[PDB]
Amino acid sequence: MQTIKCVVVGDGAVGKTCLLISYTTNKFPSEYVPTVFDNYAVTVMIGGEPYTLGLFDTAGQEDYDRLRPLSYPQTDVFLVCFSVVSPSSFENVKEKWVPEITHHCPKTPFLLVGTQIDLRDDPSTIEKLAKNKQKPITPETAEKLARDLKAVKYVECSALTQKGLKNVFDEAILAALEPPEPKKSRRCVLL
Amino acid sequence: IGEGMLADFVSQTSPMIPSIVVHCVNEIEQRGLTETGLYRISGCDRTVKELKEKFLRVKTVPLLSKVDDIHAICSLLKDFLRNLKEPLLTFRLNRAFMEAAEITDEDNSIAAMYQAVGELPQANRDTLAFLMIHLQRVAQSPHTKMDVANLAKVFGPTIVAHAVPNPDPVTMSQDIKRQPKVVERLLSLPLEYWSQFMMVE
Numbered sequence: 001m002q003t004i005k006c007v008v009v010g011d012g013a014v015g016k017t018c019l020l021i022s023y024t025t026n027k028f029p030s031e032y033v034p035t036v037f038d039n040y041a042v043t044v045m046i047g048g049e050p051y052t053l054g055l056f057d058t059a060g061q062e063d064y065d066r067l068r069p070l071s072y073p074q075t076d077v078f079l080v081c082f083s084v085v086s087p088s089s090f091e092n093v094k095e096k097w098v099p100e101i102t103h104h105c106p107k108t109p110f111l112l113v114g115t116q117i118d119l120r121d122d123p124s125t126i127e128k129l130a131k132n133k134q135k136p137i138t139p140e141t142a143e144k145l146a147r148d149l150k151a152v153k154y155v156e157c158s159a160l161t162q163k164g165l166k167n168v169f170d171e172a173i174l175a176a177l178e179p180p181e182p183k184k185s186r187r188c189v190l191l
Numbered sequence: 192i193g194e195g196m197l198a199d200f201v202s203q204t205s206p207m208i209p210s211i212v213v214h215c216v217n218e219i220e221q222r223g224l225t226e227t228g229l230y231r232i233s234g235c236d237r238t239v240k241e242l243k244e245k246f247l248r249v250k251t252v253p254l255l256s257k258v259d260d261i262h263a264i265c266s267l268l269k270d271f272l273r274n275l276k277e278p279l280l281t282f283r284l285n286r287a288f289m290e291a292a293e294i295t296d297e298d299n300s301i302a303a304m305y306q307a308v309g310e311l312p313q314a315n316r317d318t319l320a321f322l323m324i325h326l327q328r329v330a331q332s333p334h335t336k337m338d339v340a341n342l343a344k345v346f347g348p349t350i351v352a353h354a355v356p357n358p359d360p361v362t363m364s365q366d367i368k369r370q371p372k373v374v375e376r377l378l379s380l381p382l383e384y385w386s387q388f389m390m391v392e
């Protein structure tokens with residue numbers, strides 16, 4: 001059977017878990033708890049074909065830097081997430097996350113994923129950012145980093161409203177399939 | 192880079208705690224302790240590394256008063272701890288600590304914890320005490336949303352860690368599952384207990 005392994009990575013609290021849950025269950029998680037490691041699954045019907053999407057949740061804390069690489073093997077595509085309202089989480093995409101996966105999975109595709117876009121209109125949020133003379137990341141800025149770092153695409157979403165949620169995964173599915181070279185050439189390998 | 196042992200960074204004799212630790216904690220507590228996700232949110236990586244590089248040169252603790260994103264300090268602290276040549280609870284006591292937390296009987300577990308702590312070199316006990324007191328405060332601030340269990344999930348890999356430099360893939364995944372329970376016990380010890388190591392002399 002054709003299984004698609006997708007591994008989600010990125011700073012802590014950006015919403016990795018929330019998007020995996022909201023997507024797969026249409027329910028937004030209320031709890032505030034850090035993710036050590038987890039993996040969900042879903043059968044998708046694209047092109048009229050049955051595809052199993054294996055989703056892998058990981059810990060963004062640097063404390064788990066040695067345990068995270070354990071979920072990489074056999075990955076078909078990476079979802080590198082950052083919060084559109086956390087400039088630093090966007091920063092760590094080039095300073096840490098992209099460097100990490102390309103060092104472990106040189107041949108594996110990855111999509112830049114901006115999360116929590118609904119928060120671009122949050123009164124409290126915008127003000128805390130300006131308080132530090134900062135502002136949210138615009139789609140245009142992200143799209144540029146996307147190209148610069150050779151990401152397949154830039155997509156964003158709100159796990160809360162699900163705006164652009166399904167689409168993120170659709171593109172994540174196409175990225176593992178659509179290419180002409182065999183699915184094998186993109187699957188990660190240890191060492 | 193690389194860092195040495197915990198004791199290689201202590202200058203004062205009482206209590207035996209690194210300035211780097213003292214300063215990060217003071218700053219974090221200074222800014223109020225009301226920011227959501229303390230220690231859960233990563234500071235800017237470039238910033239954390241630059242602050243670290245200045246420090247590690249000759250062990251000159253930089254001014255953190257003006258670092259605006261407080262998370263970069265939380266990250267700078269954990270980074271300092273996590274990179275010591277040996278974890279805060281030391282290699283020698285790694286298992287001891289883990290199995291003292293797995294004792295299903297709360298009390299006896301509490302008792303074996305006291306015994307293990309008392310085993311640590313003074314620097315680690317003092318430094319650990321300081322931290323437990325600090326975090327118990329963090330856990331007590333509603334706004335942080337970082338309860339004992341959350342802190343335990345984030346600090347466990349850092350101060351507990353492993354019994355050897357390079358664990359194998361399986362043993363590693365095992366330790367990680369056990370680390371959190373250890374941090375939970377430590378946090379459950381009375382403030383009075385931790386405080387006694389804080390007296391100068």
Ligand SMILES: Nc1nc2c(ncn2[C@@H]2O[C@H](COP(=O)(O)OP(=O)(O)O)[C@@H](O)[C@H]2O)c(=O)[nH]1
Pocket residue numbers: 010011012013014015016017018019029030031032033034035060115116117118119157158159160161
């Ligand atoms: N407003 C808003 N909050 C979100 C969204 N996604 C996640 N969050 C919140 O961000 C914080 C961390 O979420 P989580 O999914 O655990 O991020 P993770 O640490 O990468 O797993 C929690 O408060 C989530 O409820 C979103 O789309 N909109």
Ligand SMILES: [Mg+2]
Pocket residue numbers: 016017018033034035057058
């Ligand atoms: Mg999570």
